[PDB]
Amino acid sequence: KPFLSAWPSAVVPRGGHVTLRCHYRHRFNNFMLYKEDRIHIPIFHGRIFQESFNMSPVTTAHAGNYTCRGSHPHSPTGWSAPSNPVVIMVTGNHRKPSLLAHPGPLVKSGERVILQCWSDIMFEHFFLHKEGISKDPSRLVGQIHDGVSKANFSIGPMMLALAGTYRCYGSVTHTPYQLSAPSDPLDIVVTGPYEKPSLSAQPGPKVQAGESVTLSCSSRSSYDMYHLSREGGAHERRLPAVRKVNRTFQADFPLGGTYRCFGSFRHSPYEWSDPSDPLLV
Amino acid sequence: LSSPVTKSF
Amino acid sequence: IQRTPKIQVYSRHPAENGKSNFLNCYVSGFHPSDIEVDLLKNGERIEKVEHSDLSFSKDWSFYLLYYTEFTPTEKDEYACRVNHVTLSQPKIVKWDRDM
Amino acid sequence: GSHSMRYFYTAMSRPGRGEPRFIAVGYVDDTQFVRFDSDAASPRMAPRAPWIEQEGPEYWDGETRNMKASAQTYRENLRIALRYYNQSEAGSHIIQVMYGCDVGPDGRLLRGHDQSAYDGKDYIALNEDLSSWTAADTAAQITQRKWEAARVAEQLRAYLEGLCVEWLRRYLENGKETLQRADPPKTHVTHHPISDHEATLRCWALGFYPAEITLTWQRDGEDQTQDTELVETRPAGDRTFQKWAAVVVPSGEEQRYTCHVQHEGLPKPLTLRWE
Numbered sequence A: 001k002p003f004l005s006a007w008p009s010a011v012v013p014r015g016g017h018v019t020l021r022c023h024y025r026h027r028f029n030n031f032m033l034y035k036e037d038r039i040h041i042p043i044f045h046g047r048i049f050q051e052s053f054n055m056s057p058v059t060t061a062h063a064g065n066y067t068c069r070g071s072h073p074h075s076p077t078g079w080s081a082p083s084n085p086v087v088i089m090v091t092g093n094h095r096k097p098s099l100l101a102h103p104g105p106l107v108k109s110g111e112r113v114i115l116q117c118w119s120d121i122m123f124e125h126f127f128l129h130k131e132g133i134s135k136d137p138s139r140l141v142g143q144i145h146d147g148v149s150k151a152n153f154s155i156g157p158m159m160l161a162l163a164g165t166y167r168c169y170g171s172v173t174h175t176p177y178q179l180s181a182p183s184d185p186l187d188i189v190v191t192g193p194y195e196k197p198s199l200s201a202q203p204g205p206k207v208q209a210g211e212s213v214t215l216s217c218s219s220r221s222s223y224d225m226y227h228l229s230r231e232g233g234a235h236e237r238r239l240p241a242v243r244k245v246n247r248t249f250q251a252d253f254p255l256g257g258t259y260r261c262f263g264s265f266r267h268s269p270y271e272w273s274d275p276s277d278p279l280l281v
Numbered sequence B: 001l002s003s004p005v006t007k008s009f
Numbered sequence C: 001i002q003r004t005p006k007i008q009v010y011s012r013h014p015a016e017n018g019k020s021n022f023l024n025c026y027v028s029g030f031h032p033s034d035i036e037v038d039l040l041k042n043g044e045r046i047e048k049v050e051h052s053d054l055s056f057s058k059d060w061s062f063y064l065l066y067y068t069e070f071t072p073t074e075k076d077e078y079a080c081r082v083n084h085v086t087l088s089q090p091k092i093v094k095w096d097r098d099m
Numbered sequence D: 001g002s003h004s005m006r007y008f009y010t011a012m013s014r015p016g017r018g019e020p021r022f023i024a025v026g027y028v029d030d031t032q033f034v035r036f037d038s039d040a041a042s043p044r045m046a047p048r049a050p051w052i053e054q055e056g057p058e059y060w061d062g063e064t065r066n067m068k069a070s071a072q073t074y075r076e077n078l079r080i081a082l083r084y085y086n087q088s089e090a091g092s093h094i095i096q097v098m099y100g101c102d103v104g105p106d107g108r109l110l111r112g113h114d115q116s117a118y119d120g121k122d123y124i125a126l127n128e129d130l131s132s133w134t135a136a137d138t139a140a141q142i143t144q145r146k147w148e149a150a151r152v153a154e155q156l157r158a159y160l161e162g163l164c165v166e167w168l169r170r171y172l173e174n175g176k177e178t179l180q181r182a183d184p185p186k187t188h189v190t191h192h193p194i195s196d197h198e199a200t201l202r203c204w205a206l207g208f209y210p211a212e213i214t215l216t217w218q219r220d221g222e223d224q225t226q227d228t229e230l231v232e233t234r235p236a237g238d239r240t241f242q243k244w245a246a247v248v249v250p251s252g253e254e255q256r257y258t259c260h261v262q263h264e265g266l267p268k269p270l271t272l273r274w275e
């Protein structure tokens, strides 16, 4: 049977583009497409696609559950068995829901987190999707409660493949392949097992306006970047690490509150070190 | 017995 | 950094016409790993063919053994047909009792 | 002694052709004994030699969980490698890993190994001290920094000194009558004309185990190491091996040629000649 795939993503915004490819007998040409309810009835009145099928711009009519069959002239039937199924989900068709993490977005390696999706729109289903993934979004039935519908996605035990940027979507009862606009995104970062850095203040954590204070994140480990997070919920500052004469790797953040820092590496933005001990300024 | 040690790149 | 397969075709035991034996096609030194191998009896694909689990050598090139039970004869001609990304057309290697 | 255990992993992406695949195989010396293939409908670590078959269910369950986790890890490593090398998500790539231990006659560790490759070239390797790494390029140097920060080498060293050795010892006992009993080669010389001026002498070794063997041609006692065609050692399919060595000789000089066979299954080295 052929291998059917969607490129670059099966989850695609209205107005975007997606190409279905049907790989069979080491080629990508001469195939037919089918949708889940009509299983032996080819779409577009049995169109024989001469190459990959590009849908662009994407409309809600493209959303659906697809299989392909490839041409096979020298065989009993004219054609191959049905491919694996690919579900094209088209986003941008309802008001966006909301996504929050419990207890928070920084998740220790091996532990679990809940990503809750909710909306005052009654969505029959919710979908949770990590950016850039081929994995099918996770789906849960929505639960109605006090004028909202919501679902709890359990994520973990936490490892790198689970870390990244997440969005959630809703769908309404009779158009299950039509998704809402995406929720605002949430970065879920795995922490550990890389050794924690050290945090310090210069000249010290005692400061009175208006004099300058710089916090330094330092490690003997060769971190490429440091992240400074302050309890209380504005997004971390990031700075490149610099190697010092004594062979440590350090970044200086010129700025009260309670801070921690984390190291990370090149091309690896969603896995951070264990957190430093806290520092109150 | 295979190695239990994770090798994440 | 693409490496074309070496191919050896040979029997598990010394050949003796009319005696059940095993026919082998060993492909090795290839990269990447995708490869198509069939054993042939007079140009025609033998159906009940098995192969070993993918592995590789110290130099990172892959090897696989394909094999089928068979009884050799004077007239029946056996061969191995191998395709790989590196080959424009499948290569066919005859079973030669002397190699 | 001496013996080795090795695991070999292949993780491959194939965008548009199939789902990423992870295959692992385990060997004691030249004998494969387990496999795991992510393509299977319900992937499990599975026996590939009779002497491991009677191992209990906790073994198979534990190894299956470990392979499932490793498969996930290496699928992710394929994605990471794309980032390190600035490669497109359209191309097909392969990560390969081999690791394991060598022990002496007394069953004690002689050497540990852990080497990885990307697209068929060295990527990163554990050094002989089992406490430091050699990275082949800048991409691998990122991995090296991570592994140092996470103390990976300490954990791998603990595996190689401990479980690797203890389990190799157990398998060698479980399979003693096959794994620890060398099978000597059956040997013979064949003669194949080229013209009526030249001929090929081919020295054959069949049905031997382990795979290690030395076939040499001498002409009045001098190695023809410069003029010998040596075919790659090949599996017979029954856990024994085959090899031959050939030399082109002038007609009528066949008698100054001797084939020398060395293998652990042989009491004394063999010296053969064509007749």
Ligand SMILES: *[C@@H]1O[C@H](CO)[C@@H](O)[C@H](O)[C@H]1NC(C)=O
Residues within 6 Å of the ligand: A036, A065, A067, A085, A087
């Ligand atoms: C898509 O169709 C396949 C059958 O072709 C079905 O098994 C699968 O459940 C469908 N997936 C969804 C999300 O509806």
Ligand SMILES: *[C@@H]1O[C@H](CO)[C@@H](O)[C@H](O)[C@H]1NC(C)=O
Residues within 6 Å of the ligand: A102, A114, A116, A152
């Ligand atoms: C969903 O997760 C949140 C946080 O753990 C919890 O408070 C809530 O009760 C969970 N379940 C439901 C049905 O809301």
Ligand SMILES: *[C@@H]1O[C@H](CO)[C@@H](O)[C@H](O)[C@H]1NC(C)=O
Residues within 6 Å of the ligand: A244, A245, A246, A248
């Ligand atoms: C290394 O040098 C840095 C930068 O001058 C200094 O702040 C820090 O105290 C030193 N760290 C160690 C361990 O000496």
